[PDB]
């Protein structure tokens, strides 16, 4: 059998989730005989063959379509054609912004199995069994794909471990199918907003979320961070509201706080997308009045208390 992996690149760089998918594919397969086929799609995608000629890749397909970076019409047509060519049992996409543009379209047209944002995958005998979340990550939902010869999964980033080392795939080149996209990519943009502090560099973070309530409450946390020698960061509601700069947002669409050794999460529930930015921090303290908040499932220390009462006492004690 074949497992097809759709790699991902942007702005000339391969996104590392590509290698997590290869790791997943190699783990998933049933016998040594099964093969992992990786595709990379782009008008300049030959550039990625070195970075994708890695352990666990049996075939590497460069698809040249009309656009440099992701286009949903091009990707859907291209991936449909790859599925036709390789008849994979399983197709692995990253659960990324790009994939969200097409994955469910690709699955609507055809009789394919489909599940998204999957974080456990295995075969039980010949049966593919995938696990995703339910009810804002309060449950696991375990699914199968009865009678589906092709199953398309989008895979949660930062769950599956990449393999180590080089590889020697059979490399091929195909043109994408020849259909005109209904959209055209224009500029990438890094929007305005202050940028006095690169939060990917800092080691001590106090981060605020929706639990702070009104904007008038931000100042007291800024003072706390200052008194503590921490950098003030936030979750997306705070930045969306314009209360702190986007450069201070932690998570998938914000930044990853790679240098951070101590993260104090105040009034942040711990959404998946927030966790993407900070789950690696060796010491996380959560201060949150909801014991059922997801943040407590990754925190080292939890305090189920009012953030304003804790902040004022912390200030006093400091």
């Amino acid at each position: 059998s074949k497992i097809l992996v759709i790699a991902e690149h942007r702005r000339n760089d391969l996104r590392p989730v590509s290698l997590e998918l290869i790791g997943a594919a190699n783990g998933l397969k049933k016998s040594g005989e099964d093969k992992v086929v990786v595709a990379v799609i782009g008008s300049q995608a030959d550039a990625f063959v070195p970075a994708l000629s890695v352990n666990g890749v049996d075939e590497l397909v460069v698809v040249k379509g009309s656009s440099i970076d992701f286009d949903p019409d091009v990707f859907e047509a291209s991936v449909s054609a790859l599925i036709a060519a390789h008849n994979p049992s399983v197709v692995l996409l990253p659960h990324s912004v790009d994939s969200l543009g097409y994955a469910s379209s690709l699955a609507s047209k055809t009789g394919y199995g489909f599940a998204t944002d999957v974080y456990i995958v295995e075969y039980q005998g010949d049966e593919l069994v995938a696990t995703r979340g339910g009810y804002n990550q309060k449950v696991n939902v375990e699914v199968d794909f009865p009678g589906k010869s092709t199953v398309v999964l989008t895979i949660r980033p930062s769950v599956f471990k990449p393999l180590e080392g080089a590889g020697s795939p059979v490399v091929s080149n195909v043109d994408a199918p020849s259909v005109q996209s209904r959209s055209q990519n224009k500029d990438y943009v890094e929007v305005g907003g202050g940028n006095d502090i690169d939060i990917t560099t800092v080691d001590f973070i106090m981060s605020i979320g929706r639990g702070i309530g009104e904007e008038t409450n931000v100042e007291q946390f800024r003072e706390l961070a200052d008194e503590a020698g921490a950098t003030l960061c936030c979750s997306c509601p705070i930045a969306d509201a314009g209360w702190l700069p986007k450069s201070r947002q932690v998570g998938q669409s914000g930044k990853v706080v790679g240098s951070c050794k101590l993260y104090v999460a105040m009034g942040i529930s711990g959404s998946i997308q927030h966790m993407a930015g900070m789950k690696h921090v060796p010491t996380i303290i959560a201060v949150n009045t909801d014991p059922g908040a997801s943040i407590f499932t990754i925190a080292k220390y939890g305090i189920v208390a009012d953030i304003f009462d804790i902040e004022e006492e912390l200030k006093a004690q400091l």
């Binding site: 339910g134 794909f145 009865p146 224009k186 101590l262």
Partner: protein
């Protein structure tokens, strides 16, 4: 000129919820329902277009779901949606994102809107699939994770900005009509927390039991379960001592 906004009434769970006997779902006694957060932003975006235009813009909200959903629809009308439509039959129970996409598409074919908006994802299941499934059945242009929309009613293209990983956006020019999935933060919804709802059956839209429900879905639920998850070290006691422990943790850190 018409903008169709697909909306979902999501379920959130109370503390100490239980898995139901069949092991297939959570017991409904523990569910609280409200409008999906992404739908506040999508609806406000349709209303912004309506306000910006001298031309009439009809804003229609549509939801596929049981009668509890009417409460959420009523609230959309009160915030200025022109019409609200609820599609349901009991046979639709257990319809996944792709089947919901099918059902929505049958309404949309009849409404013949100029744009379709959906949320990036639902707060409960977070499939991030339903709106882009609709685009497929309609065979319309589409973009997901839209953080900005430059669009005048009647225009044959729009310019959007998709919100990417890592603090960047991408401008994309997209043919209209289009399906857009709308991200948090695109706008600041105005009403943040006796025209009836139009009630539509599967028959009204040409569907039957065999087109919908769990049997037509793209995966099969085996079980639902509360997994063992990581456990924090909880600091009990007074605020003074909880703060005292934080400071010791800070000091241990430096």
């Amino acid at each position: 000129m018409k903008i169709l906004v697909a909306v979902k009434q999501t379920a959130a769970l109370e503390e100490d919820f239980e898995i139901r006997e069949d092991g297939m779902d959570v017991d409904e006694d523990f569910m609280m329902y409200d409008l999906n957060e992404w739908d506040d932003f999508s609806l406000e975006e349709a209303m912004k277009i309506k306000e910006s235009s001298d031309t009439d813009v009809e804003v229609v909200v549509v939801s596929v779901g049981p009668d509890r959903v009417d409460e959420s629809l009523r609230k959309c009308l009160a915030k200025g949606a022109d019409r609200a439509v609820r599609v349901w039959d009991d046979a639709a129970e257990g319809s996944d994102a792709i089947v919901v996409g099918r059902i929505l598409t049958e309404v949309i074919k009849k409404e013949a809107p100029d744009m379709v908006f959906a949320g990036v994802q639902s707060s409960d299941q977070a499939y991030a699939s339903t709106g882009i499934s609709v685009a497929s059945y309609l065979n319309w242009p589409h973009a997901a994770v839209v953080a900005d929309l430059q669009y005048k009613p009647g225009d044959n293209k729009a310019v959007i900005r998709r919100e990417l990983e890592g603090g960047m956006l991408q401008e994309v020019e997209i043919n209209c009509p289009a399906v857009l999935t709308i991200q948090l933060g695109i706008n600041k919804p105005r009403y943040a927390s006796t025209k009836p709802i139009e009630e539509v059956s599967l028959a009204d839209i040409g569907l039957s039991a065999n087109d919908v429900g769990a049997a037509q879905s793209m995966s099969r639920v085996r079980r639902m379960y509360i997994p063992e998850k990581g456990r924090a070290t909880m600091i009990e006691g007074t605020i003074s001592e909880q703060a005292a422990k934080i400071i010791q943790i800070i000091n241990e850190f430096k």
